[PDB]
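During the second half of the funding period, the structural biology subgroup turned its attention to how the target accommodates small molecules. The most pressing case was sodium ion, which had performed well in the primary screen but for which no bound structure existed. We therefore specified the complex as follows and requested a full 3D prediction, including the ligand pose.
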Amino acid sequence: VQLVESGGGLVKPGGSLKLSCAASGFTFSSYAMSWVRQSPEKRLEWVAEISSGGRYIYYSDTVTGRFTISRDNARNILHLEMSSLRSEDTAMYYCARGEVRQRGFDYWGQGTTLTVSSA
Amino acid sequence: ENVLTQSPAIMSTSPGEKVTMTCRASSSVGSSYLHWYQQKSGASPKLWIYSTSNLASGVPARFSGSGSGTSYSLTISSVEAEDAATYYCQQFSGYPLTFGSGTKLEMK
Amino acid sequence: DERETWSGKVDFLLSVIGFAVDLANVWRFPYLCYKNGGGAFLVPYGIMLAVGGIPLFYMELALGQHNRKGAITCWGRLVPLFKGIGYAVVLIAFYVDFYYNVIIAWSLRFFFASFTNSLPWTSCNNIWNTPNCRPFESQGFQSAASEYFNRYILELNRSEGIHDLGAIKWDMALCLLIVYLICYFSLWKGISTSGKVVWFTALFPYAALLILLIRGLTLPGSFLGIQYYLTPNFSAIYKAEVWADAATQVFFSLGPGFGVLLAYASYNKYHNNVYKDALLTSFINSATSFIAGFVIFSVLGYMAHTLGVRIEDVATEGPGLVFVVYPAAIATMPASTFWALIFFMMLATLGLDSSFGGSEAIITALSDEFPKIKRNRELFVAGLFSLYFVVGLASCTQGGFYFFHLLDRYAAGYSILVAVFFEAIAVSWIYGTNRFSEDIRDMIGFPPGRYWQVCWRFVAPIFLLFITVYLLIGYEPLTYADYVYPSWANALGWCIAGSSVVMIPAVAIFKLLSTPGSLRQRFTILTTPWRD
Ligand SMILES: CC(C)CCC[C@@H](C)[C@H]1CC[C@H]2[C@@H]3CC=C4C[C@@H](OC(=O)CCC(=O)O)CC[C@]4(C)[C@H]3CC[C@]12C
Ligand SMILES: CC(C)CCC[C@@H](C)[C@H]1CC[C@H]2[C@@H]3CC=C4C[C@@H](O)CC[C@]4(C)[C@H]3CC[C@]12C
Ligand SMILES: CCCC(=O)NCCCN1CCc2c([nH]c3ccc(Cl)cc23)C1
Ligand SMILES: [Cl-]
Ligand code: NA
């Protein structure tokens, strides 16, 4: 099993971006993936979760309404669409496998850096 | 919210010392839903303990987890220079999921 | 759209245990073990319990907790095409309440009959006895307790048959009134009171099965009865009939898919660990059956050893066990009055909360579907139990046992099997065990492991099909003690059985005519769950 994320880099404040995570080595359709982001102070923060089939979705209050988690069980791709990005969204985003609440995020992606600024 | 605050925020040890780090929950977390993660610098976190106690696959037996309710602890019976990482607790019982502020072992 | 909750986890557990622990645990399972090879029957029984039995029981509890609605709306939301399943299950519960409460009425009638220094079924010298009476069971004779039950409690031999109910026995009608008063004043306010009354009705049976088990095993000849109960004869389990008896007993003992567990689980907190509850309550379900088998057969051993009665004569199922054979034993042992009192109170409490189950299935389903009678629960439940009483007067007539037995065979047996078969099909194939596994994961935090998915998808419908096919292979026109029912009565029986199952296709067709578009678009619109 490994997860690898794609998308990132520099986005203007108030801009938008789509992160992606590619899943391999396991039957992706039957695992409830999650997104977790790490701020540069290395504080972890859970961003969003999507169930196995994508019918149950959850968000943290700091992200709700701004982001949109999404899933592709045919191509084994996980997505996180972002809108109204803010400076506080500057973080590394980890794809996390997270199927069983009594197991936690047992597999993590490599993470991709996202930075929100004008430069 | 159910914020979790870990203590100490920073820690340092000689190898072979025995140390404990704690995760305090602002609301009671079911003993089945508290986890611990290890993050080494520059790499992704890994699952380390997946309840109060159960060690994750490939985790060395030197670690153990204990406690329940609002005060959870990760213990190391003999600390080894080959960990020296940052450990985050997490609750999974209620949404939003909250990781702790994290704590770090720095080898003296 | 938020709703009341149990106000206690133990109220849910004790209510499901109450419903799942019927008289059938006492008067059927021990007989099946004796008949079908003793302790070897626990192989067919254990296998059919693990496969199909508990899977369907867990499936129903999970559906109830997830959808937060009683049967009619739960199935209308889950798979609109099969909405008729909810109406079928509600009709079946409704038809059960006409006959099932009579067993409790008889239990109370014997309870009040026990308040005497010398129990009346002790002997053949009473005005109701015939010269064919004998003290205990024998071939070609009637036992004194059988004479008491038939000729004094039922007065059955005053009726020519089901065409001749005769006079109402008002001493029985008063007992059935007391039964419906207890049901009313427990159910009228809903789970706020039902959950507290089950703390008595679901736990007193285990006070009885404790102290009455201690009485049993201390009798002389007890161990002979335990030998008849559990001497393993593995030659018997090679015969498919034993597997059909095991499967049907598991299904009806647990009562999975009966809509009562939907009703009770609907009041759970959404994140309640329904899996642990399904396993705990089915384990006690079978446990209680096994212990009640020691309770019964220790006394049947005492009889077969001490009273000389042939074991083949006393070892029997149904009312004949608990109102003839077992009280005939109680009449002989020290403190007969005390054992009679606690035994018949045990039967009463085993019946009461099993009846609360069907009544709460009806009242939840109709509350959730029709708010006009969610807001007026008290008046509705008074009208319901008044209907059950006015009809049950027929079952309190002298011929009343014939009506009881007609409903007891036809009212629910066949119809609930096809209803639960369509439940397992709608859940596992039309709704999808993938979606149902997401739902369970979201509730309890882990998906049901592949074992449960294989059971619900493939083995549960085969299990139910095997049960119903063996019930139809085993069909023979209704008969009782050399009274053979007229063909019009069997026809009425099959009409009562059909009246519920016909709701499934009738409602499916009505739904399929009202939805617009081409046939495939109607099928899709009717298959999409309400929450999608
Ligand atoms: C007289 C009384 C005391 C007997 C009652 C015992 C039953 C409650 C036991 C006997 C075999 C058990 C079954 C055997 C096997 C399984 C499979 C096993 O599979 C699992 O669910 C665990 C693994 C997973 O969840 O993936 C546990 C459920 C079940 C049906 C058990 C549920 C309880 C059963 C029926
Ligand atoms: C008398 C002998 C044969 C059997 C007695 C066993 C009795 C004591 C057992 C059987 C079923 C058990 C109950 C089943 C479920 C629950 C819910 C749990 O949250 C509290 C314990 C409680 C309420 C148990 C109490 C003890 C109990 C009643
Ligand atoms: C051995 C197979 C034949 C058999 O045992 N026939 C008796 C059937 C026993 N009956 C099953 C249906 C049934 C009962 N009590 C209920 C409450 C509510 C609802 Cl919805 C259904 C039922 C009780
Ligand atoms: Cl049983
Ligand atoms: Na039972």
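Two results from this model are relevant to the next phase. The pocket of cholesterol hemisuccinate (ligand 1) is lined by residues C 46, 49-50, 54, 279, 282-283, 286-287, 290, 449, 451-452 (CB under 6 Å). Chain C touches chain A through eleven residues (CB under 8 Å).
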